[PDB]
Structure formats: C-alpha cells, structure tokens
Amino acid sequence: MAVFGAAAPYLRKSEKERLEAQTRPFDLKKDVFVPDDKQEFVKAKIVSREGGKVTAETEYGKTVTVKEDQVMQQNPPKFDKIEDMAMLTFLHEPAVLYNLKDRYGSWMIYTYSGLFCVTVNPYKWLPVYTPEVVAAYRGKKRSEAPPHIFSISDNAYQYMLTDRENQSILITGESGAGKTVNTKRVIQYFAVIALEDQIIQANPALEAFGNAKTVRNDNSSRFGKFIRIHFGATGKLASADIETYLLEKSRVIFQLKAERDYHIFYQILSNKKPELLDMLLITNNPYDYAFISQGETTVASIDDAEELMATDNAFDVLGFTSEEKNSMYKLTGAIMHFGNMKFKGGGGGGGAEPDGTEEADKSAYLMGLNSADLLKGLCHPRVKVGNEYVTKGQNVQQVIYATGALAKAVYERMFNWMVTRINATLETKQPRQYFIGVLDIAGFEIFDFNSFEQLCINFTNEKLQQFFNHHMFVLEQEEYKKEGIEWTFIDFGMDLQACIDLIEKPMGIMSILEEECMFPKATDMTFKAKLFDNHLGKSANFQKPRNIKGKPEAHFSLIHYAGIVDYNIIGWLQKNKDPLNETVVGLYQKSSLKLLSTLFANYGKGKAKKGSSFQTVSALHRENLNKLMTNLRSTHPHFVRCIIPNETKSPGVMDNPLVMHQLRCNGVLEGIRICRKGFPNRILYGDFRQRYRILNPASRKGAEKLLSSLDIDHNQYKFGHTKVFFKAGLLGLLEEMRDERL
C-alpha cells in the first residue's frame, strides 16, 4: 500500500484499521432495517416482534411501529465497508445507500458496483489526483487495484491495445456536479498515458449554446455530447473528434412556466455590449419579445455578462475571424424576431395575409432577403407537382407552425455548423487509428409535471439502460462459460424491452401521436381516448394515472426501470408538429449571406422521400437515437456513475431522498436486482476453507462432505471447479451458525 503515497487513506484504508473497526456490537436477529417517515429507512434496534406490532428505537429516539411484512436484515460487521456491491451478502435497496453513506463518512470516494463505478464528488481538495499517483499506478490490473477511475481507464486502454477493439466510456450525472472537471481529469490521465487546453478553451462555446435552466438544475445540459479520442498506430495519443446528438428543439419555442430557454438569448441581452444591441435594433426589454417572455424571465443562476465575455474571447482566440461572430450574433437576433410576425385571415378568402410588416422588413434586411418575397413564400408556398409548379394555400395555424419549424431548423443547423467548425479547428494531422469514446447524456429526469421532452429523455435513458442490461448479461454468460457454471440462459433484455416496444413500435404511443397530429381535427381528448382504447388492459405497461399530495394533473402512467412515471398529454399535439417550408429554404439558399451554407441541402430505382408536412419531432428523435445506437453498439462500453451527496453545498451532510432518487435514476437498483436472481456471491475454495472449515473440524470430496452436514439444500448453491457460488440466505445461515459456534 506504500506505493499509493499519502493519498492511500482515501484510496483505501489500512488492513489494521479495518480489523480494528470490524469488532463492534451487532445482533443480526433484531438489528434489521426499519421503514421511516422522514427518510425511506433508518437504523434502529427492534425490541421484539410482538405479532404484527414492533417497537424500533432509532438513533433519533423514536418508538414508531411498522408492519411486519416490510422488515429486512442489515449488513453484519464482517462485510461492512465492502468495495463491491455485487459481493454484499444481503442485497437491498437502502443497504447500498447506507454503505455508501458510511463510506463517504470515511471519505471512500470511489466504489465498485459490479459493472458500475460509483463516484461522489468531494467538496474538498484531495491528494488522490496528484500526478505521482498516476505515474506510480501503472502496472496494476483492475481486480487488485482498489476503486478509482484510473483502474477502468487502464483496463480499457489494455483492452484496446491487446484485444484490438474500440472501447467507450459512458458518464452519467447532473451537469454542474463535477462532470466537466471529471472529464478534464480523465483526459489529463489519457494525456499522461499518451489537446486538453484546446478542449477546455472550446467547451464554453458548447455549454453556452447547449444548456438551459430547469427546476432541478440551473445549468442543465440537453444535447448528447460525445468525444472520440483517437490514437496512433503505436498506441500513442493522436487527436480528438467531437460530435453532438439528440439536441432538443422544443426548448427554443416552448418553455415550461418555471423554466428558462437557452442561455444564448439571455446572454445576448446583456447590456455591457451596447454595440450589438444598437446594430441589431434589439429591444432591450425581454418582456416585449414573445419567445422568451413565456418562460421564466431570469434567475440568479450565473452572471451572463462575464460568461458572454469569456465566450467571445474564446471565439476570438479561435481560428476564425470576427465577421463570422457577427454573423452568428445577427442570425440569433433574426431568430429572435420571428415571434413578432402576425397574420390576419382574409375577409373574403380562407388564406391569411400579414398585418404588420416592420418586423418582417427589419428581419429581411438582416438576412439580406426581400420582405415581400418572404411574405409571399410564407403565405403562398410553391410546390412541384409532376413537371409544373403550383401554389398552396396556408391558414394562420399552418403559417405559425411553419415559422416555428423554420426557426428550430435554422437554430439546429447553426449548432451543427458550429460543432463542425470546432471539430475542424481541433483536428490535427495525426493518423486516426482505433479510438476511445466518451459519452455524456442527460439523466432519467423526473418531475411532477412530466411532458413530451421529459418523455423523450426518459425513453432515451431507458434504451441506454436496456443496452447496459444486455451488455452485463453477455459478460455474465462469458464468466459462466469461463467457469463452466452455465445455467439460466434466458436473456435479460426482453423484460425491459417490453416497455420499449410500447413506444417506438407501430401502434405505440409515439406512433399514435405521430398519426394523430396528421389528422386535421385531432384534439387532446381524442388523443387520450385513442390511447386508452388501444392500450388499457391490452398492454402490460400502460395503466391509469395516480393522484398524490394534490398533484396538478395526471393523464397516464408508465412503468419504467426507475418506477412509475406519469405524463401530461396537454400541449403535446401542438408542439409535435414540425412542418418545414421548402420555398423559404430555397430563398435562404439564394440569400447573399453565409446562411446559405447551413441550408445548402434540405427537403434507375425510384426511392421516395418524405413530405414537408409529414415532419414531426418524435420521428427525428427516434431516427437520431437509431443512428446513435448503430454506432455505440460497435464499441465495448464502460459505465461511470456520478452521484450528488446532498442538495446543499455543505460537505458531509446527506439527504437520503436525494440519494434514493439518484440511485433509482442511475439504474444501480436494476443491476442489483438482475444480479440477485442468479448467484451473486462467489467465493474461492481456498478462502471458503480457511474461513469455514472450523465449522466441521476433521478438495471436491471435502467440500461435499462439509456442505452435506450443514443441511444445505441442493438448489441453494452451485458446485464449481474454481469458485463456489452461494445464495444470500446460505451466507446468512453460515454467519449465524458461525456466531453461535464461537
């Protein structure tokens, strides 16, 4: 342990201290966990089990009584502070929480969770990250190396070198909890093992254009950032590539009441730069504008002035000039003014024509287009039929939807072009051999007012979890075939895929919504009725909603790996539509500004494309997810979990409900549940002998004789050649009879 220097304590405690802490009073019979009101569970001593009534004295001194059917044992001393949750003798939902709690009490930051890694961000500087530890750590395999990110990083590096296959790392956590600095130190580790400054310099542009304020977090990130770190032929760092996925467009136009839009607009409205405001003719009052005033106007999340200044400086020190920066600023201003458009139905005709044109005039001046041409295109889109062009009629609702779709599409194209430019600037001329992926995605966010965006996020998280379950099953089967202990071949995928099939497949909620928005007279009540007719009783995951503590509204509830989640239908139909206008795109391509580059291309065998009108956000999302899964599945994945310890900044203190929510959304409970149905406890015959042979004082025959005398049933264990597998109950019985033996 001397190798780990003075960071050794945090990395692991000394064996002497472990032995010293092992011995402390614990009666397994009546020291079991008890349900609590303030928290999910508390540590309390049960006086006795008087029928269905019990008396538990907790650390707070309460004498509350609980039902006898929800009592559950507690970890014995000899297995406390365990490094891996897979090895815990009794696997229970709050047991992991309490073990992590008491481990962070001793400041054990990093923990194994079978295939998972649990890392809680410390609030104080620690020597674990000193580069001396990095230098001296090389040469240790994952098994013996205690928990830390470096262990899995080195394991993946070794896999990529030897097995000759791509590896990927998946990080899960809330933005602002240390994810950025964690990625920074991980890339620093990779550099040490052989452009961190460039990545740090380029991040501000990314989070400035990709984060927005939500109720849970003031700096919530939405888009699925991804970074592929490439290497040379000789296993040396070569260069890095950056890609983005699953960027949400609904946030641009529609925002919840207590949430903000993207930070770009608020930052632009900063008064410390008057030149931009005056040259863009921007109204300094955010209330006047329509797109922003709907959501929360402003919060004390982050001072936008210096953040905007830093982003501008980072752009200035980047490869491109200031004319391009002015271009993005003016295009963002143009995106801002599309909300001032107004249209009035013609008195004598169904078609609706504009009433005001000053906003249209200034916008067209901004893009260098013609106001009359733009108004004609919006009002009278041209379409190609056969070999001739014809004009189509549009009403107020259709033109409003078209304007919203145009704004969302132009913003998405701006973001994609920015990402491509950043990638090109970061690109170096080194050869690109096998890469290491790094994936950051939004978590399984849960609200009391879940909506369409939350549904998409939850669906993506559920698909990711299903992938993780499949990967873990493959690893378990590989281990079983290696050990020759092979049973229960049923795959662990369909169990979670049952809910997936109710979303993406035809006749699913998403498909039904996509069809319904096409129907000319669809309404929310009709959509709910169609959902109920097609899924109530017929599906095993669709069920009625539930009303608790006066929740504002609930229409339907789904069962996920994270529990029961209810969604609100209201508002979904209006925002699902994304009907683009072709003639406006053609006009943009004809423009005299850089915009034409972003809208360069948009819509003997005769393949058929998709109509503009037949465009919905839900489909694109699905498509994007697919084109992600067809890529991420090509690499061996690795998982990293980050858990916030408390809502407050105070170190040490914890809020049990927050930890419960983090664990539920991270899928750790799902992993433990998948592990417990099999044989999670596996022990070598040497250790088993040296620890349990004193029970029957006197290797296949010896083990068989020893177990035959313990009244162990045949189905409670698996008898192998290298390791022996036991059930949790067997371990508990062995512990009890060891306690009575001594």
Binding site: G386, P520, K605, G606, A608, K609, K610, G611
Partner: protein, 183 residues
C-alpha cells in the same frame, strides 16, 4: 417499406409515393396507334404509344381514352397504362409496394373486381386498397364535415360528409364533365 398512391382519374393519371407533398408523375391517360403505313425500313416503330409520349407524336396517331366516364372500357389499354406508370414513370417494382387506388362513387362492381384482379395477378402487388374520391378530397382540405363537389374530366359528383359519417342516400352523380365541355 413504403406505400404507393396511384390515381387513374380520367384524362390524367397521377401517381407517386405515399407521404409526398405532390404526385411525382402526372400524364394524360391516352393510348395511341399509328394509322398510316410507314415507309422507312430499320427504324422499327413500336405498335403502341402510351402516355405523354403519345402527345409528341399526336399528329400521326389515333388517340383513344381507355375510360369514358369512370368505367374502364378497354382493359388492355388500362393494363398498358398501369405498366407504363409503374415501370417507365416511377421505375419501381410493384412486387414490394402496397397500392392505393382511387375510384368514383356509384360504379359497376365488376369494375372494382376486375381492377383488383388485375392488380393482384398481373402485377402481384402484395396488398392493395380502393378509396372514394370525395373522402380523399375532404382529407386533403383539412376538414371533417361539409359537402364536397368533385368535378374531374369524366364525372361530377357531390358527396356530403358530416363528422366523418357519409350520407349514401344523398350522394349525387352527374355525367357532365370536362370532356363534354370540350365537345
């Protein structure tokens, strides 16, 4: 796979893939035959000109319309029209594309029966469906009620639909159409 929407109509065949904003192929439903002898040897003129091509050679052909008022009267010509539409216009194999066909109200049942038989046997389309012009026209108009007056080149008919429910006893048909206007 993707669905295929073809409208024979009358005097103008228009076809395309489902989900598109406008039909890809639009051309007159005309079959032309040469009425002269032909003296040049080696060119090898074909015995039947079909579709828009017949317009180019309009001056040496006897143009015939396969359908008079909705009802098909020359089945071989209709087969030629459908073959041209499927192969020389859309360049797709109907073996893997369901076909939606449009047919006017109040027509002989033998017409639909023969249409479906030809589609299923000659072209082996995996599946097909037949719809009414009025319902589709109402669909395209973004409406669920109202009375729709469809007046093509073959027949003019009025169909009232209320809340997605038709009124068969109130459907009216009149044989006056564009062809009579031209005459």
């Amino acid at each position: 796979t993707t669905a295929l929407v073809c409208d024979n109509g009358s005097g103008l065949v228009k076809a395309g893939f489902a989900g598109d904003d406008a039909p890809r192929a639009v051309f007159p439903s005309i079959v032309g035959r040469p009425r002269h002898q032909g003296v040049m040897v080696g060119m090898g003129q074909k015995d039947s000109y079909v579709g828009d091509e017949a317009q180019s050679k309009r001056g040496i052909l006897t143009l015939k319309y396969p359908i008079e008022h909705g009802i098909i009267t020359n089945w071989d010509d209709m087969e030629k029209i459908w073959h041209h539409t499927f192969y020389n216009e859309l360049r797709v194999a109907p073996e893997e594309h369901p076909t939606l066909l449009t047919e006017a109200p109040l027509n002989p049942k033998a017409n639909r029966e023969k249409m479906t038989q030809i589609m299923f046997e000659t072209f082996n389309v995996p599946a097909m469906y037949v719809a009414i012009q009025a319902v589709l026209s109402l669909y395209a108009s973004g409406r669920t009620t109202g009375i729709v007056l469809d007046s093509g080149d073959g027949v003019t008919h009025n169909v009232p639909i209320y809340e997605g429910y038709a009124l068969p006893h109130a459907i009216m048909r009149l044989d006056l159409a564009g062809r009579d206007l031209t005459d």
